[PDB]
Each structure stands twice: as C-alpha cells, then as structure tokens.
Structure 1
Amino acid sequence: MKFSELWLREWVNPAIDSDALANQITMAGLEVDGVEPVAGSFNGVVVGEVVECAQHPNADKLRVTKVNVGGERLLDIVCGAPNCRQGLKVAVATIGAILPGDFKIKAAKLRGEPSEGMLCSFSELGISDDHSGIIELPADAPLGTDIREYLKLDDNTIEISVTPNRADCLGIIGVARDVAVLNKAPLQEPEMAPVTATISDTLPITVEAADACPRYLGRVVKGINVNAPTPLWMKEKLRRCGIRSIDAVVDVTNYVLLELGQPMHAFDKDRIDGGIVVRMAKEGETVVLLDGSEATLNADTLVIADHHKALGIAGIFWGEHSGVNGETQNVLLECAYFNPLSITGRARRHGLHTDASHRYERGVDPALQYKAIERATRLLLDICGGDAGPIIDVSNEATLPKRATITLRRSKLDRLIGHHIADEQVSDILRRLGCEVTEGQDEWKAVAPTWRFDMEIEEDLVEEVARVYGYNNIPDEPIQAGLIMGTHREADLSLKRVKTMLNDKGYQEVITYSFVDPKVQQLIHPGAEALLLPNPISVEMSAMRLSLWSGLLATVVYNQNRQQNRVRIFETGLRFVPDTQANLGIRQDLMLAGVICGNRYDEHWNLAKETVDFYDLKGDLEAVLDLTGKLGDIQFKAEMNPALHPGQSAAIYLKDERIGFIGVVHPELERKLDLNGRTLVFELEWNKLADRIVPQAREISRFPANRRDIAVVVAENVPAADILSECKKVGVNQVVGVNLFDVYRGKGVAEGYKSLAISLILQDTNRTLEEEEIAATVAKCVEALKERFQASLRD
C-alpha cells in the first residue's frame, strides 16, 4: 500500500511533525516502508496565463508569443511546447527560481528569440510521468502565488505494509480510525449527503446465492459522457498513490476504493440483455480475460451472470468488452460484499491478482454501501452529466457476518499482561476502540465492531487493550522459575567438543547449501536415486543431499579458483536418503563430514614438501572418532564405493556396523569439477559414536619391562589385520602394547614379501618377567601365527 500525508490529514490533524507522524504510524501496527518525496526541490514556480498565440518566424518551433503572470510589467516569455494553445494557464519558471536537475535556466539563443525562463512540464519540474506536454492546469485561479503551496507539494508518499490481521485499514478511513484512537484526537468524518433520485426504473437484479454474497447494490446513471476530462483536483490525489488514469470513471471508482476500502468499478447497461443473476457457474464454464488467455473454473468460483453467458468474476476480474468503451451511454455499479471464507484461493488459482481480490479475501466493512455508492455517484454526476435512479437492494438478513459476545475477566487480563490497568481506563479503551461496553462486577462483556474481522476471542481483546495502552508504558520484571537441575549423562559426547578438537587439529568449519545440483550430484552416488524438487530456484539447485560431498567439493573449487590453496574444511549437517520403511519416506541421519587437501606442513624451514595421504587422514581421524569414544574394537577393511579409489579407501566398523567412509576420491572423478591437486574426504554417521565409556580403576604394578624385537616375514597380501591384532589375544597376563617402527622391503627380503618390525613391551601384572617366561609368549604367538601361512624370519 502507499498513500499521501495531507489526504490522511484531512481526517485527523495531529500537530506533531512532518516525520514524527510516520513514527507513530509504526507504533499502531502498520510497518512503514520508507517516506519518499513527491517532487524536486525548487524555490517557487509561479503560474500565469498566455494570450493571443502565434507561429514561428524562421525555425520549426512555435510559441513566440508572451505570457501574463500578473506583474505590473509585461515580459515576453516564449516556449516550444506541442500543446501551448491560447488560454491555457500553466506554471512557468522565472528569475526568482531554480529548476532541479542541475539545469538552471539561462538566456542563450535557441533558433530565434532567446528565452528567459521556460515552461515547466511534469518531468521539467521535479515530478515524474509526463503525458503530452505542459501542465493543463484548470482556470478560475488567483495568480502570483506559488505552485508549491497551491498544488500541495509539501506532503510525502508513505508506503505502509498491512499484515493480514488488520482487514479494515487498507484505506484512509481505516488508517484514520486508528491514528485517532492511538493518539486520542477526535476524528471528523466528512458528512455524506443522500442522493434524492429523480428518474425512472432500473434493470432488476436477484441473487440466488444466499451464503456467498450477503449484499449487492448498484445504480443507473443515464446520460453520462465518458469523453469528459479527468479533474485535476482528484488526479493529484490519485497521482501520489501510484495510480495512473484510464479515462474518468475508472479514476472515480479507484478513488472511492482508496478512500473507503470498498471495491467497485462499473457495468455497461445495454450489453446486459436479460437481467443480472448472481450464482455459481456450472462445471466447465469459460469466460474471457484481458491478457489474451481464455480461462475456466471448476464449480466453486462465483460468477456475476444473467440468463445468458456470464460476464464477470466475483470481485477479481470484471471484463474487457462488458466494461465501458468510448461510446457507453448508461452505467451500472457493482458495490458488493463476499464471504471471505468463500472467496479465498480463486486469485492464485488462475494466476490472478487484483486490488479488489486482495480486499475481498481478507475482509471488507459490511456496513458501508449506503455511504460508498453515494460518495461514488456524487463524484460521478458532479464531473459528468446525467442523473441517478433509485437504489437497488438485495440482502440476506441472517447470513451476514455476526459478532460474538467476547466476555473478558480480570484474571485473564492480569495474568496475560502482568500490569494493573484500572477498570476506569479499560472501559474507556474499549469504548474509544468503538465497541459496545457493558461492564459488570470483576468482568467485561463487549461485542465486536463491524469493520474489524479479527476480534472473536479474549486474546483479541487483551491485545487490543495493550496495543493502545502502549507496550513501552509497561515496566520490566525477570521471570519466576523453579530451579530443577535437569538430567545429564557422562557416558556420551557433545558436538562442540569434537568440533573444538577439529579446530585444534587445524580445520576450518564451513556451512554450505543443503540442496545441490543433480548434474554433479549423480556423479558421486550413482544407483541411489535422488529426492527431486518441484518449483526450484534454478536447475543448479534442484536436488536434496545424498551425502555431504557435493557442497564441500563445490567449496573447494570455489576457493581454488580464487588463487588460494591448501583449504581444510569440515561441515556437520544432516542428509536425506530415500527409503520405504521410514517416518515420512526418507530416513535422516545427522552426519559429520570433511575435506582435507593441499600441502601438509605449509612450507616450513625443515619440514619437507610432501602432499597429504590416507595415513595422515586416518591418523587425524582416529583421534576424532576413537579417542573421545570407544577404541575398543575398530576394524578397517576394504569395502568399495563408486566415488573413491578402491585401494586407498576403507570402511570403519566399530563392532560389525558400517559407520564411515574415508579415503581419497577417484582419480578420474577430478577430471570433472577440476579439483586441482589430490583431495581427501571422510564422512561419519553421528549418532552411533555418540556414547563414550565411563572409566574404571584397576590395580597397577611397579616392576619394569623389556623391549623385544620381532620381524615377521609375510607376503605383500595382508596389511595389518592378522599381524598386529592376533598378537594381543594370545595370553591375557603377559602381552601389553604393540608397536611398529620400520618396514622391510629393501634388497635383503624376497620379492613380493615383506617384514614388519613388531616391537613389544612384555610385563606381568603381579610379578616381573625374566628370560624364561618371555620365550614362552614369543613362541606361542608364532604358534598362533602359522595359521596365516607365514611365521617369523631367521636373522
């Protein structure tokens, strides 16, 4: 919405300021979207009149004659306008004036006699939207005075944005019935006289829809002239509110819509032929539209009709050829109401939006017609010829919107506000809002007004009491609670702890878009279909996640294209996998993911230049997962995935469950996206590693231990699964600890075979270990190692 200042000040005149009115309009419920100017900043433009026009002597531009401002001297002032006929009083720039736009008028030569202050059009003065030429200002005006005071340029256009709770204040009367109460100034309603009909009868109407149109009116006006000029005194009111003219009658019936909130435009009478009957349309009924499309309805759309093919949708779209053309003689009006539960979705159903449909959906003042149609016909017959017939009443007395008895008690008001507002003030707040107040003992009974469609329950009285009492006229107090501790748990983790660990190891945390590209989303997870998205933003973002490796490998190639390398990021979010035995069709897990790439050590003075690999990722990950969690049993095996290398990748288990995927991506995956340099990724399923173990003490010994070196020779087939793990299970009182410090694949070992240096620190829980019992437990592990087709080496 947008409306002007002085039009609002016709109804209530608060002597506050030119801008502190816009600060008290936003303390009532209407969020103002800026206060914009109306014109440029000049210093006076005086209006005069022209006499006895003439033609150009030598050039091709006419108007070589004088003007008459009203000074006692007569100065020759010329122009070149396309409409400067004789007897057209226009404002003009003079010597005591500056024209905005940094083009100050001078006295140079332009194709003939010089000009000494030119004519100001619309765009030549400070305002917008030229039509043809100079200002066609109406006559019978005193001269010498200023256009800045005369045409009322000292106001502004405020753009208010009403919320759907308030259906009344979409117009001047709705806003100024609210400012008057919120500042307690009295509101002067302009008195609206009746019409005193003079002429014969009217085409009769009848509504056969008693539940979706409680009222409907109209009037004939016979003998109008649609070629009449639009009055400027109403054009300047319609100008500031962003409303452009059509001819005259659409202006008159946009003015009454803006002024009173009541929607009405026009009917032609001779193109009716059979009466007006208002009813629902049959299935498959088709009407026309202005844009060139020919749309239909289903069964529900109310259509204004006759005993023939129908001609108008209910308060949403009127009609092209059923409207007034340039030869229409008689006109009928549509002052109608519609039940807002009955007209809801028919605007957005057919791709329609119109300012009358915007009002009929929320609501409209149901006691308004006998003022609205009479103001409209007054402004119609006062600017055109003709006269009006009698009113046309069709109304249903029982299906009107009725008002409840909203009883309020002192307990609810006190328990909901917190403050003590006196009954002497509450019984005045509701009366000045405009309700009928019957106050009793410790209670209030107040029925609703007609114009507001948001007062049916007790909160809708408490809110409207406190809104006019003021929110910042209530003091403060902290709450009163009971200090229940609330349960905790020691044997679990938090997210912030693992995130603070990732920051300790050197990882940025990013947050990406949670819906990604289906083109480079299927290149990571083929086979599993995606959750597509109707009505997207573009084709680039039209698919939910299936993992977290889409936005991350978008962020990496964002940063690497901005001449900035070695990006280490991670991100925790939740993914969307399609299923069938799930809650809503997709199962969702919280996921912790990441990306490492670039250089390892960042160019240090002794640390060499070696790019990162899988052992670094797994070592920096085992601290994340298996330190703050179990490390009880965690097995790394080889499980394939069509997004990464088969060898340099793993599948973390933690007691027989697929919990993770780690390792460098496929080396032909990086041919797309162009991720310069070798990257690595590591995903983890969160709420299965979200429980730690609470530790327990045990008796500790004192005696030292010794370091025994074993170098088992194995072929290059088993990595560590049956080498470093079966050593611990043999003997539960002698072997603790197992290390490795040097591989052996040089020249001494046989080809295709390897020796892993397996150091041990053997110790006993109650005594020490001497040279006799060590030879039992080193040989017993080798006796348990010959089931893996190898044994120890001879060196």
Structure 2
Amino acid sequence: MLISNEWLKDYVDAGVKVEDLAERITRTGIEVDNMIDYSKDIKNLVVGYIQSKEKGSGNICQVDIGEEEPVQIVCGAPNVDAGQHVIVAKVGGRLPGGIKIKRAKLRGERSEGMICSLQEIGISSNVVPKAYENGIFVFPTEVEPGTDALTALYLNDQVMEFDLTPNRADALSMVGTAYEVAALYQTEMTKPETQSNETSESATNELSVTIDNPEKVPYYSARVVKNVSIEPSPIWVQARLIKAGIRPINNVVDISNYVLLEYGQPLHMFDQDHIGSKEIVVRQAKDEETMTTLDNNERKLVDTDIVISNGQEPIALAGVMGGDFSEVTEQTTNVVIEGAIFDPVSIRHTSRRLNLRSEASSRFEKGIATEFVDEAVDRACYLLQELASGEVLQDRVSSGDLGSFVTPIDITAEKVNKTIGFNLSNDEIQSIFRQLGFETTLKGETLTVNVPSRRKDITIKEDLIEEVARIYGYDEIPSSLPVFGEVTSGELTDRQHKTRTLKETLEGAGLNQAITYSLVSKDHAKDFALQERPTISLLMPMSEAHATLRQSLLPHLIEATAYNVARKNKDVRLYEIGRVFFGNGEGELPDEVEYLSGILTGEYVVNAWQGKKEEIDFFIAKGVVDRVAEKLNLEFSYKAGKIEGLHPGRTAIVSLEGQDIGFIGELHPQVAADNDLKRTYVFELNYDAMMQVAVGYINYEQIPKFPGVTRDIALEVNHDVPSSELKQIIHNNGEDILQSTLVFDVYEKGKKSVAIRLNYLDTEDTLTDERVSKIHDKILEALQAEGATI
C-alpha cells in the first residue's frame, strides 16, 4: 500500500519528517518497506506558460517562466501548443537518468530549457495519462509561471510503501492510516468533506435496488448524480493516483479510484442512461450464464459468481469487472455510484478464476469497514459535484443492514497485565484505548472499550491486548520464565535416547548422516519395497523428481552416491533414519514407517604410505549392521536372498524375532553401472520393528575364576549350506556351557570344509571334562544327523 506524505497531511499532521514517521509506524506494527521520493534527481523545474508557438520548421516556443523576459524553448513534441501551462527544466537543471539542461541551439536556433513529459521527470509510462503519454505534460488548469513545478504537480513528496499484514486492512486507505498516525502522535485527525449541495429530486424516484443473495451481499447502495461533464481531473487527483500506481483516466473514473484510496471503499460507476433499466438487481450468476466484460472478453459464469443485473441481463461481474455497455464513457452525463459489500470468498474466487484481480477487488477480499460505506459514496458524490459539474440527488437507494459501527468489548487491567507481564493502571490502559480513538468507560475495575467498525480486526479482547502491548511497546515487556507447579524431569523417551545413541555409533564407524528428499519420481516410488503396497502421489507436484512418496531410502541415497562419485568423491559412507510411506488406500492416512538405511562404497581403511587399503565389501557392510545390532542389544539373523536392485549372490535378508525387517546387499552390477558406481553396498531396515524389541537391562554374567575349554571342529557340507545352520545346531546342543562359536575358515568339487572353534565355559558352576565331552559329542552327533561329515 502506497501512502503519500503530502496527501496524508490533509487528514492529520504528525509534526515530523517522513523518515521519523515511517520509523514510528514500523515500530508499532506496520512495516514500511520503503520510501519513494518524487523530488529525487530534479533541480530547477518550474511552471511555464506557452505564449506563442512557431513551427516553420521545428517547434519554437516562447514561454513565460515568471522572469522579466520569456525564454525560447525548442520542443519537438506533437501536442505542445500556445495557451498551455507546462513543466520547464531550466538551464542549469537536472532530471533523473543523469540528464543535464544546457543552453543550446537546435537547427541553428536557441533553446533555453526544456518542456517535459511526466516520464522525463521519473514517472512510469504505466501511470502516465493517455493524453500526455507520447508528448509533454499539460496542467489541467492555470498556474503562476515561475512556481516550483514539483510543488504545483503535487510530487514534491515522499511516499511510504507499507507491507501490511492481513490484520490491518484499515491501513489500506488514507483515512485508516490517518487514524493510526493520529493515535501514534496523539493529534487530531480530520475526515474530508462529503456534504453535497443536494437538488430537489431523490434517487428514491430514480432507482430501485433489490438484493436476491443476501447471504452473499450484506449491503448494496447507490446514489445518482446528474449532468456530469467529463474532462481531466485536477492535478492533485492526478498526482495522488499516480503516486499510488494508478493511471488517471478522467474526472469521473478517477473519483472512484481516489475514494477507493481515500476511504478504502470500492465504488463503481454506471452511466445512468445506459444501465438499460431503472432496476438494479444483485444475485448469483446462473450456471453457464455468459457475460461480456468491459473488456470485450466473454466470461463463462458459474453459480458461485455474483453479478449485477437489470432485468434480463448482467451489467457487471459484481466487485470484479464492469460489463460492456453500462460503463462510463466520454459521452456520459448522469451517473449512478455503487457502494456495496460483497462476500470476501465469492470475490476472491471469481477474480482468481478469471484472472481479474484488481486493487478494488482485493479490498473486498480483505474485508470492508461498514462505518465508511455510505460516507464514501457521499464523498464521491461530493467530488463529482466539485470536479465533474455534477448535480447530487438527495438520498441513497440501498438494500441490507450495516450493523452498529461500534462493538463494545469489556476488559479488565488484570487480564491485560497477566497476559503480557505488565503492571499498568486502569488509567494508563484507558488512555491507550482513547489514544486509539476508542471511547472507553471505567465502571469499577472493568473498562468497556467501544471498538469502531473501521477496526474490523478487533472483535475479542485478546485483540485489545495486542493494541496495548504494541502501543506501549514490546520493548518494555519484561523478560520472565514460566515456573511450572507440576514438576517433571525433562528426558528423552527410550526410543529418542536409543536413536541419539545409535546415530553416535554409526558416526563412530565412519558413516555420515544423510538427509534425503521424501519425494521421488513415480517410477521409483516402489523401488526396493518388499511388500506390495500403494504409493502416495501428490495432486500437484512441482517436479517430476518429486511426485510420489518414497517406499525406501535407497533411491535418493543411491542418487547421492552417484553425485558424489561424479564429483570425484569416491569414498561415500552414509546412513539415514527417515520415514517411508505406504498407502492405506483412499482418503486414509498412510503408514509412515521409520527406516534405517545406508550405503557404502570406496575404501573403509586407508593409509597409502603403509600400503594399507581395505576396500568396502559385503562383510564390512554386514559389520555395520552387526554393530547396530550389538549397540541395541538385538539378535539379527541373515539368510541369502534375492532383491530388485541387488547382486543376487551377494544379498541377504535380515530377520529379528522371526520377522524379516530388511536386507543388505551389493548393488546389481547393472544398477552400479548405470550410476557409474564401483562396488557399492546398501542396507535397509525397519527401525520401527527394531524399536519394538524391549531389551531391558544388560544381563551380566560372572567372571570365571578358572579357564574354559576350546575345541576346533572341522566339517564337510553341501557346499551350498549356510554356516548359519552349523552354528545353529551346535548352539542348540551346547546347553548351559557353550559360550561362543566361530567359523574361522572355509574351503571349496561339491562339498565345503567349515572349521569352527567352540568355546566352553561355566562362570556359575565347576566345569568338568566329562560334561564337556558329553556335550561335545552330542553336538557332533546332532551335526551328523542334520547331515554333516566329520
């Protein structure tokens, strides 16, 4: 929102330069994002009167500039003429873009200065009125030659740009902002004149208004002013529109933009003698109704759209765009003025659908102050009198009820102080509400604050708390800490704690913590998933890279390894703990399951000068996963397997308590090769499953005071059998006293040798050679019978 200082001073004076104004407004709630200075880079700009013009062969002009003698100015501009008051940069003068005004000679003829376009004093074409767009500017009325031009133009001015919050629609206007400034500086604000010299007729006899959709149109009024003559607006209207980024059009069209800016009330003008009727009718559009906007585009309506009509026919999209016949033109002489409140959501959706967003429609979206609907109509009627030769009919034709324009809210100072941490008296609080221009009465220890409808943000008394605090000052709010009366020690949950610990142990082993994107390409969303299960796609992805949730962490960890490797980062070691997502079908939240995965390639251990290089292989990758199981006190088993992206003779499934919870494996040589990767290993695990095992306290065993016994057996097997199966019977037969086993060697045509070292021990009772041979030989017999030589 663009607020001119110059202009604002019509309603309130803060007594202060514009920079101090901005700073105090910013401090108290409304951000001034910047300040536009219309005087900038301009020197020696004065009004001239063009006394005579010769064009026997450039345009040579004699210009009164308030000196003794006229100056000759050569000006090539298609619209310059005698009789015109104009803008002159004098010799010695400066204009934006580093332009210098020199004594000169054009085609052998003196020029003492330059007559300017608005663009040439820094105005954007976007907001230059059509009349002067492709030549020079001409003042709409007479001004004394020699007068300061910027001052005459109402552009010797700075303009604050507010970047407002939705809270503060009130500052979408000059009148709102002046109420804010008047509070801040504790000074009087004055609204403008809206009393017109009214005729003997009434609009009651001119016009009917009926509202058909009152759920959707809380109010609609109109007034009539007759015998308007259309011509340029005065220069202060023009310049104020310009400073606010609106192109001036003409006196009548301009009045409605002006009063929009002044009061915040969107106004519409219809040619009275072209409504096509003497009834206005507000209602919904009918499904697949058409209209044509002023615009000459044809607008397919839906029934959610509000139109204005007469009786057969839409004369406008309400609040959004006029139609192609009821509008003001150069020929118009009688006008009807609308002041209506339309439903915010209706307007927001219509303008968005049809890409017909305007400054006026955004006012309807952000909500309208009831206190100013009639007053702002009355203001435009007044201005039309004053600047459009208008004749103002008595009365208003309206439908609907605006409420009360104050809403009382009760509050105590205890509630204020206890919410904020303040110690203000009723006096100081009551004075704040008055400062803000709120009538506030104290009965006992209760203030009734009479909150005017021009602050439509304030409805409940927490709203009124923020006023106090922002006005009195957030700087002044005391620093405390809450004292809780129910005492609890703050700690990580078990799961939270284990997760910190586990990350620590993965970092301790050389793995970097990754964080990958949850969203994958729809093609890859089911990559590495083991249960078939629906994937979850976004209605509106911004990228095909990020269209579908993730049923595995491995696609992006593979990508991430591919990326590092391409950048010559050959040693990649990463882990992630993150959610994957599985559809519970339609309209249902998915299962979000926390995984633990990682990926490894390169050296694990390197010291070149010693000739040390240990390349990551599968058993390193298992070591990582073993180390996760150790730290967590969990028992994992491992059986050969076949998966998706994986080397089929170097992949294993991982089980915990007879549940499969993940896998480890080398990437398929094809997938490696696609990604320019060397030998690479990944693992993926259901962390949710892991975290369900309650492991309790560590089970301590006593330290043996005497030795145990170690025997190494040597087997022969289906070269073809899992070592896991040996370990399992052995350990099934070793009872009380088998402490540990180790496969320490393998050989392989058709059979393999497995050397395994058994460690017997009894920390509890006295171990004997007789029990150890009894058990040993029952071991080697369980082995023989589940199919084992030696």
Q: Is the Cα contact below 8 Å between 2:538 and 2:548 reproduced in 1?
A: yes
Q: Is the Cα contact below 8 Å between 1:509 and 1:569 reproduced in 2?
A: yes
Q: Is the Cα contact below 8 Å between 1:490 and 1:694 reproduced in 2?
A: no
Aligned equivalent of 1:509: 513
Aligned equivalent of 1:560: 565
The one-letter amino acid of 1:502's match is L
* Structure 1 segment 479-490 matched on structure 2, within 5 A: 479-482=482-485, 484-486=487-489
Report the Cα distance in structure 2 between the residues aligned to 1:73 and 1:267, rounded to whole angstroms. 49
Q: The residue matched to 1:519 in structure 2 has which SS?
A: coil
Q: The residue matched to 2:297 in structure 1 has which SS?
A: coil
More helix by share: 2
Report the Cα distance in structure 2 between the residues aligned to 1:350 and 1:95, rounded to whole angstroms. 51
* Consecutive unaligned residues in structure 2, runs of 5 or more: none
2:783 is the counterpart of 1:785: yes
Report the Cα distance in structure 2 between the residues aligned to 1:500 and 1:125, rounded to whole angstroms. 66
Describe the shift of the 1:569–1:33 C-alpha distance in structure 2 as closer, same or farther (beyond 3 A).
Answer: farther
Report the Cα distance in structure 2 between the residues aligned to 1:578 and 1:259, rounded to whole angstroms. 55
Return the offset for 1:771.
Answer: 6.5
2:156 is the counterpart of 1:124: no
Describe the shift of the 1:718–1:681 C-alpha distance in structure 2 as closer, same or farther (beyond 3 A).
Answer: same
Aligned equivalent of 1:219: 223
Report the Cα distance in structure 1 between the residues aligned to 2:639 and 2:514, rounded to whole angstroms. 30
Q: Is the Cα contact below 8 Å between 2:734 and 2:776 reproduced in 1?
A: no
2:52 is the counterpart of 1:21: no
Report the Cα distance in structure 2 between the residues aligned to 1:386 and 1:194, rounded to whole angstroms. 10
The one-letter amino acid of 2:544's match is V
Q: The residue matched to 1:694 in structure 2 has which SS?
A: coil
For 2:80, which of 79, 84, 101 is the aligned residue?
84
* RMSD over equivalenced CA pairs, Å: 3.2
Report the Cα distance in structure 1 between the residues aligned to 2:482 and 2:306, rounded to whole angstroms. 53
Answer with 541-550 or 170-179: which moved more: 541-550
Report the Cα distance in structure 1 between the residues aligned to 2:646 and 2:723, rounded to whole angstroms. 22
Return the offset for 1:498.
Answer: 1.5
Return the offset for 1:293.
Answer: 4.2
More strand by share: 2
Q: Is the Cα contact below 8 Å between 2:116 and 2:137 reproduced in 1?
A: yes
Q: Is the Cα contact below 8 Å between 1:198 and 1:387 reproduced in 2?
A: no
1:218-273 Cα deviation digits (max 9, x unpaired) = 233333344x2243221110111111233442222100001001110211223334
2:765 is the counterpart of 1:760: no
Q: The residue matched to 1:791 in structure 2 has which SS?
A: coil
Report the Cα distance in structure 2 between the residues aligned to 1:563 and 1:296, rounded to whole angstroms. 59
Aligned equivalent of 2:160: 158
Q: Is the Cα contact below 8 Å between 1:743 and 1:754 reproduced in 2?
A: yes
1:500-526 Cα deviation digits (max 9, x unpaired) = 222222222232322222234355559
1:664-687 Cα deviation digits (max 9, x unpaired) = 233333455x34333322222223
* Structure 1 segment 462-541 matched on structure 2, within 5 A: 462-482=465-485, 484-486=487-489, 493-521=497-525, 528-541=533-546
Aligned equivalent of 2:337: 333
Return the offset for 1:348.
Answer: 4.3
Aligned equivalent of 2:681: 680
Report the Cα distance in structure 2 between the residues aligned to 1:489 and 1:469, rounded to whole angstroms. 41
Return the offset for 1:110.
Answer: 6.3
Report the Cα distance in structure 1 between the residues aligned to 2:429 and 2:388, rounded to whole angstroms. 49
Aligned equivalent of 1:601: 605
* Structure 1 segment 526-675 matched on structure 2, within 5 A: 528-580=533-585, 584-601=588-605, 604-609=608-613, 611-624=615-628, 626-631=629-634, 633-670=635-672, 672=674, 674-675=675-676
Report the Cα distance in structure 1 between the residues aligned to 2:116 and 2:345, rounded to whole angstroms. 51
Q: Is the Cα contact below 8 Å between 2:153 and 2:235 reproduced in 1?
A: no
The one-letter amino acid of 1:128's match is S
2:266 is the counterpart of 1:268: no
Q: The residue matched to 1:434 in structure 2 has which SS?
A: coil
Return the offset for 1:205.
Answer: 0.6
Given the two structures, how large is their TM-score scaled by the length of structure 1?
0.89
Report the Cα distance in structure 1 between the residues aligned to 2:246 and 2:196, rounded to whole angstroms. 28
The one-letter amino acid of 1:689's match is M
1:458-486 Cα deviation digits (max 9, x unpaired) = 32333333332322233333322237234
Report the Cα distance in structure 2 between the residues aligned to 1:490 and 1:322, rounded to whole angstroms. 70
Return the offset for 1:177.
Answer: 0.7
Q: The residue matched to 2:254 in structure 1 has which SS?
A: helix
Describe the shift of the 1:283–1:766 C-alpha distance in structure 2 as closer, same or farther (beyond 3 A).
Answer: closer
Q: The residue matched to 1:26 in structure 2 has which SS?
A: helix
Report the Cα distance in structure 1 between the residues aligned to 2:486 and 2:377, rounded to whole angstroms. 64
* Structure 1 segment 297-316 matched on structure 2, within 5 A: 297-298=302-303, 301-316=305-320
Report the Cα distance in structure 2 between the residues aligned to 1:87 and 1:489, rounded to whole angstroms. 85
Identity of aligned pairs, percent?
Answer: 33
Answer with 85-94 or 518-527: which moved more: 518-527
For 1:438, which of 438, 441, 455 is the aligned residue?
441
The one-letter amino acid of 1:545's match is R
Report the Cα distance in structure 1 between the residues aligned to 2:400 and 2:493, rounded to whole angstroms. 70
Q: The residue matched to 1:52 in structure 2 has which SS?
A: strand
Report the Cα distance in structure 1 between the residues aligned to 2:297 and 2:42, rounded to whole angstroms. 45
Report the Cα distance in structure 2 between the residues aligned to 1:105 and 1:343, rounded to whole angstroms. 50
Q: The residue matched to 2:27 in structure 1 has which SS?
A: coil
Q: Is the Cα contact below 8 Å between 2:251 and 2:388 reproduced in 1?
A: no
The one-letter amino acid of 1:236's match is A
The one-letter amino acid of 1:539's match is E
Report the Cα distance in structure 2 between the residues aligned to 1:600 and 1:355, rounded to whole angstroms. 64
Q: Is the Cα contact below 8 Å between 1:214 and 1:400 reproduced in 2?
A: no
Given the two structures, how large is their TM-score scaled by the length of structure 2?
0.89
Number of aligned residue pairs: 776
Aligned equivalent of 2:704: 701
Report the Cα distance in structure 2 between the residues aligned to 1:149 and 1:208, rounded to whole angstroms. 46
Describe the shift of the 1:221–1:194 C-alpha distance in structure 2 as closer, same or farther (beyond 3 A).
Answer: closer
Answer with 361-370 or 533-542: which moved more: 361-370
Q: The residue matched to 1:669 in structure 2 has which SS?
A: helix
Return the offset for 1:186.
Answer: 2.0
Return the offset for 1:41.
Answer: 1.8
Report the Cα distance in structure 1 between the residues aligned to 2:111 and 2:577, rounded to whole angstroms. 73
Describe the shift of the 1:71–1:563 C-alpha distance in structure 2 as closer, same or farther (beyond 3 A).
Answer: farther
Answer with 173-182 or 304-313: which moved more: 304-313
Answer with 282-291 or 661-670: which moved more: 282-291
Report the Cα distance in structure 2 between the residues aligned to 1:271 and 1:524, rounded to whole angstroms. 70
Return the offset for 1:386.
Answer: 4.2
Aligned equivalent of 2:369: 365
Q: Is the Cα contact below 8 Å between 1:629 and 1:693 reproduced in 2?
A: no
Q: Is the Cα contact below 8 Å between 1:703 and 1:767 reproduced in 2?
A: no
Describe the shift of the 1:109–1:783 C-alpha distance in structure 2 as closer, same or farther (beyond 3 A).
Answer: farther
Describe the shift of the 1:370–1:700 C-alpha distance in structure 2 as closer, same or farther (beyond 3 A).
Answer: closer
For 1:427, which of 408, 425, 430 is the aligned residue?
430
For 2:174, which of 155, 164, 172 is the aligned residue?
172
Describe the shift of the 1:109–1:720 C-alpha distance in structure 2 as closer, same or farther (beyond 3 A).
Answer: farther
Aligned equivalent of 2:184: 182
Report the Cα distance in structure 2 between the residues aligned to 1:465 and 1:327, rounded to whole angstroms. 53
Describe the shift of the 1:592–1:119 C-alpha distance in structure 2 as closer, same or farther (beyond 3 A).
Answer: farther
For 2:451, which of 442, 448, 457 is the aligned residue?
448
The one-letter amino acid of 1:470's match is G
Describe the shift of the 1:487–1:7 C-alpha distance in structure 2 as closer, same or farther (beyond 3 A).
Answer: closer
2:59 is the counterpart of 1:63: yes
Q: The residue matched to 2:504 in structure 1 has which SS?
A: helix
2:258 is the counterpart of 1:255: yes
Return the offset for 1:277.
Answer: 3.9
Q: Is the Cα contact below 8 Å between 1:48 and 1:70 reproduced in 2?
A: yes
Describe the shift of the 1:197–1:665 C-alpha distance in structure 2 as closer, same or farther (beyond 3 A).
Answer: farther
